[PDB]
Write a protein that binds this ligand. Structure first.
Ligand code: NA
Lengths: 466, 467, 467, 466
């Protein structure tokens, strides 16, 4: 330790002392930004998750507070002319929160609800999510209150070009590599890359989510679903004494890209997917979905945009249960993978799953499991894999896109998948060891919180706390 | 001509009631974008209401005004520094680069614990039109930090200033953004920040104003605001009071800082007598006026000894002190009132006394000294009010002259700087009158200053394609 | 002294016949390098022939001249932009950076469908020596696009200007290349391009001239070329016609644009009487001359209504109109002819009438107005011809004064700019006479302008190592 | 040959003629820098070592003289404030000696003895040492007369930040990549990286020796000691007819990272390390150090900062000999590894090792063996592995750190170790082949000098001698 003298708070502390210090830190965050509700909530949640670390050494709470101030925030006017010839002014943002582990990394959101508080909350959390990938990536977030909905393609191009005319000044392949998010998909990434390239007169990996013809990476559509299965597989080996997906009945909720590619990789590991779901209900195959059946489901949902119920016209064994969740299926379920939406698995759902024998839950979606549902799982000793780690496959592959751009070499699909699998392996071990080191063995949720923070905190001190 | 007409949705003349509703719509839009920036919202409201005569001629100006209210760029940044105890401190730094249509972003830096984005946006937005009025090619901006200089050692201020400029230097430059001093940022801080900027940039340029005259600074900088106030009132007296001047005028001055002191000196130069100075303890009064020698004595008490104005009674047998009273209460005739102390220092009752005491004109040395009720009293009495937005702009005008001297790599004599400052205030006073007359508020110099400052920016913004 | 002698293969004096063959070999070399650039080849040929007296004293000047004929840098670029219908349009943009020996590249931008590299190289090459003649530290350049502004909306011109400057900004700068206006690039386009340059560079500098006075522009810009023409002719009359002046002179002016209008204004200031203006439709004639009040009316018709000169007869009871005739046909005594309309507007037949009507001097406001046959007639008649390369350089002279004001961050009064323009034209007229006298072509101001412009560049090129 | 016309001296020359030309070159160097004793001595030693090359073509002597002038030297004021609040001014340096093969590369030294002569001497040799690694790296060296002794962590932080505030202007990932040296370890690299990152607003490999959490490489602490053992192992196989470290008693001098990890790799190859030494004396184990014993010694020297005599408290069989060198130990020695300091092995010590049966010497430190000692070994037929190649493992791994940074990909420890071993293998072959090509067969010292020089000399001419 070469930075000990810099910190006012140091040494061990009791749980009650840490609770008081956390509340003091929260009040300090509030006084600095009294009306940033989302950011304040995010700081409070992450701080509470790190209480075991703060008890061992109070310096970590100070570092946490120091990390809570963005290194740089750029807000800028974005003038653009709509198709009617009228000048429009929108607000643009790039929160460059932390660059300790690498260049600022995080998506861009174009949505009318976007403001500084929301981007700070997402950007702050992205620091530790990117940390967990093991890759050299910092944390950031940006976007605009520009609303793409109802706008023509030309209007989106006009906005993307004017937005990037300013953003290019603050980003770069070794500085800040933004990505997509709500309102920023392939269309917007492409428009922004063209403008960035024209202004910079350079072809670099300054954005991720690019098309494979010009710097993009394979496995991007599959990354999140595959990464979820990888993480759960490695947790089963590392925390369930050599257990595996093999022979496991896998109940999957959702019918989107995450659920589809999660089911494929489960079958690759010898598991049996038995359910898919949408807002209309869930479908169930007693003997599981084959890959060929998953392929049929993909075209119905992706091309025909149909409901899951249409699948029964293709399988004679398929059953459809209207207005029910996948957790209601009357069979034994060994693994539950919520891959649909937030708070989709509640206390009642968790109780059913425990009664049906599920040994582990993997969060494919964002915050799928309610806090009450988590409590039942902890009592039942059912492992919960946190989404911040289990669904990090997308950001992991965004880092692999940077590697390919830095190497000016496009990897084969097999190679990208191999490194994604290695990333989830190292991430799962880091979460387990972190939980064990702080005497919350098996609490992967705590392990993910600790592992992400500590790599940033220690690197911050290595670099002189600047 | 008009090459940007097609870009604006609102256009054409509008009635007074219609303009009132449109302004209210504009305010609501500003509120939704920044719902809790109280100071910025009110600043937008005040300036918008002051421009209603313009909006009635063409609603396009309201849309331009709304467009100008969004900063071109805001940079907020972490400022880590180590205090004398060896402990790491983190403060928030800001630079609001609001508008650069007329020139590089220009505006002071404030180091005070109350600093936040709303306050800096309010000051920076207003700085656009203040700098416009100087006739010089300067934009508008404002920055600073919630760093609290109170209780800090010189070394800690040095450490913070160097870390603050380590990030700020990346966003400023002699042709880009030229910051200056403000509350908490004086000669000490400007010097510390200039040293760091020079070291990192490996260049010697006019990237800050307020520099010492030994390395790029300008003469007349301490005197600029007080002199400029007297110049402006002098020119208004000539043009709107039929050749009147400061000659023979009894001038009640509030405040005892640099603005009040150098305004007093210039009043004497123009043949008037300053009769009062004041601070929080009260006001002092000389029935036959303060001489330049007496003003110098009072300066030493306030600037070196940091004493109260009452101390002056030890030096003058004729001086009278009135505790806990404002200078407007002085029991004598007052022809010119120059509020140079603080906001809302001249209220409705004060305006009424001054009218009865023979006041013909008010020159605002401080910011918003005269309350709205006081302004109504003066307009009914036909007492001219010279708005602070123009009358106290002498300081920023000389900061622009500092930039000119740096760009020319030539230090002007004090006489040359003083002449150009006087010429600036002359053209500014004429622009305010002409704007007021053109929009049928003849003699309303408050409206004229609002209009003249806004229109030069709005028209140049359209010339440049509204980018 | 001479430190670059060893670098040149050709050196020493040569006979007139030897120079003729050397010039042809130089021309053949230029043709082989650019065989189809007709305008550039002819421009090189004309200037080379005008410099034959110099080449005879030392053939190295021919080698220097040939070296100068290759641009230091030419940038051609695609300009994609979206029209009001939403359709992608691609035009070609150019910037010919011909020579920077005396200072940053300087020259206008032309937006016209006929624009190509040959035309821009011809104009840019001549711009080197024209800017040289102003005495100011300016190089030579030219740029533009085949974009056709006619039929385009203001918004479409804005889109093109912004896309055009998005690439051009990468190659220009206040100390590198300062473009200006030309055909198709006026106040609208300069403003649009300035906005885009400012946003991308994040700086406020004098990287374009022709700006509006509210943001870095200069007074006297509209009047500069017309005023400069009259200044130049006035000095030539004093120096070569034994103290003669514009006083009492009847001046036939061709054209009705800004050059002719402000030339007429300055003639009246000097006591002259302008008697004609002309258009594509014909010419108008006032027997007793146009007063400034009358010129003001013509300005409104031509600049605001953009009507033809025949409209003037509705306002003057004495005005006469002659369709399909040039102003030189006017039936009266003519003492001064000022062609300010177009190339080859004054032919041999026109010159003979003007001599018969008593013309003592011709001043070229336009470019190449006088045909080669017409020049011979005037030389035989001993009527002085003031070359356009010097006489119409007032515009570029003031563009240089705009750069000085930007570099100084100080706007000059109109009086100061006018005084400096007049002094420039005085030194230029002296430079042309002295250069002509030194090479034994006394009184040939056309050759004097060629020689004086070339030599300052040629000598400085050698000072700088011929790089 | 496209640069022949540029050189005044050319063609073959007799041995006596080469000696006269070398002496003129030395005098020319002296007149240019009459008081830079170390630099003059370094130029003289290398020039004499390259005499066989100069005899084949005198242009090489002219190239060598041309290389002796640095491309660029930046010396600069370094102002910083100590913990008492007092302004201190130190001198900073960066000698950017040659960039023919790649960006300037070399360590930074913070020590009160530092001056221009020492840095030119170290930087000049660094050119050819880096050449031998086969990696695309130039040569340089820098530092300051700042004395870390007696300074607090914060004072070192203050100096490092001010030092990098100027240095950052002259370095970069493709221009100059500094590294550590005496007085510049993990603490200083971390502090300087933090300052460089903040000022440049970028995350790149502009320093090596970084921590693996942010751009660092595995095997970096072990690289020089491991590389020394790899090199000697290959020389034993190639020049001692298939011999190896197995069963060899290895006397190691020094107790720093080089000596510790050299002992570690010796044990991997079946050898027996018997001694360690420091300024206080040397310790001796009759039956050798095990890895557990080396692990204890590492903790004493690296954490406790104690003298080697402390080891006797943990091993009953260890012996301590005050104020004596490890070469005096009374036993048979098969391999000598001087890994402590310059001129640590003198003529008398070499005589003892020959008497005790030493068959090969591996130079871990810089210039460890005196010229008199080298003569003893050459007469005795004891092979000397030159430090210029044998201790280049550290700079080799610093090049692998650069590759990983340029690839934005962290290699496994196994991958780094194999590439280090392959580099040392090719280097040992290059030294033998170069010595053979210039008819000094078996003179590995001469071979290392020739192989490093020729790649730079030929590449310099390829690039127009600019
Ligand atoms: Na790379």
């Amino acid at each position: 330790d070469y930075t000990r003298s810099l910190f006012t708070l140091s040494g061990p502390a009791t749980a009650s002392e840490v609770e008081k210090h956390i509340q003091n830190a929260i009040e300090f965050v509030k006084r600095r930004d009294p009306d940033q509700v989302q950011f304040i909530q995010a700081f409070t949640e992450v701080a509470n998750g790190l209480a075991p670390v703060f008890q061992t050494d109070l310096k970590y709470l100070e570092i946490f507070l120091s990390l809570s101030e963005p290194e740089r925030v750029i807000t800028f006017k974005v003038p653009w002319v709509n198709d009617a010839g009228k000048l429009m002014i929108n607000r643009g943002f790039r929160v460059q929160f932390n660059s300790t582990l690498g260049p600022y990394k995080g998506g861009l959101r174009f949505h009318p609800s976007v403001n500084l508080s929301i981007l700070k909350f997402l950007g702050f959390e992205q620091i530790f999510k990117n940390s967990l990938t093991t890759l050299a990536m910092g944390g950031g977030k940006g976007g605009s209150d520009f609303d793409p909905k109802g706008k023509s393609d030309n209007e989106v191009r006009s906005f993307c070009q004017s937005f990037m005319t300013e953003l290019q000044r603050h980003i770069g392949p070794d500085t800040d590599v933004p990505a997509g998010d709500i309102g920023v998909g392939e269309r917007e990434i492409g428009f922004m890359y063209g403008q960035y390239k024209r202004l910079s007169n350079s072809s670099t990996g300054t954005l991720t989510g690019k098309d494979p013809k010009w710097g993009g990476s394979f496995i991007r559509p599959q990354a999140t679903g595959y990464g979820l299965v990888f993480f759960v597989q490695y947790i089963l080996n590392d925390l369930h004494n050599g257990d595996s997906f093999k022979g496991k009945r896998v109940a999957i909720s959702g019918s989107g890209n995450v659920a589809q590619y999660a089911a494929d990789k489960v079958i690759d590991f010898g598991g049996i997917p038995i359910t898919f779901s949408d807002s209309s209900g869930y479908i169930y195959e007693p003997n599981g979905f084959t890959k060929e059946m998953v392929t049929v489901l993909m075209e119905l949902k992706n091309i025909q945009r149909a409901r899951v119920s249409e699948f029964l016209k293709y399988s004679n064994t398929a059953k459809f249960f209207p207005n029910k969740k996948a957790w209601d299926v009357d069979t034994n379920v060994n693994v539950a993978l919520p891959c649909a939406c937030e708070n989709e698995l509640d206390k009642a759902d968790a109780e059913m799953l425990v009664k049906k024998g599920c040994i582990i839950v993997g969060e494919g979606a964002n915050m799928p499991t309610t806090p009450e549902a988590i409590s039942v799982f902890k009592a039942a000793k059912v492992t919960v894999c946190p989404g911040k780690a289990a669904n990090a496959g997308g950001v992991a592959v965004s880092g692999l896109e940077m590697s390919q751009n830095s190497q000016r070499e496009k990897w084969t699909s097999e190679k990208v998948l191999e490194k994604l699998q290695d990333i989830m392996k190292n991430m799962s071990k880091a979460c387990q060891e972190a939980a064990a080191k702080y005497n919350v063995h098996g609490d992967i949720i705590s392990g993910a919180n600790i592992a992400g923070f500590l790599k940033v905190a220690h690197s911050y001190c290595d670099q002189g706390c600047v």
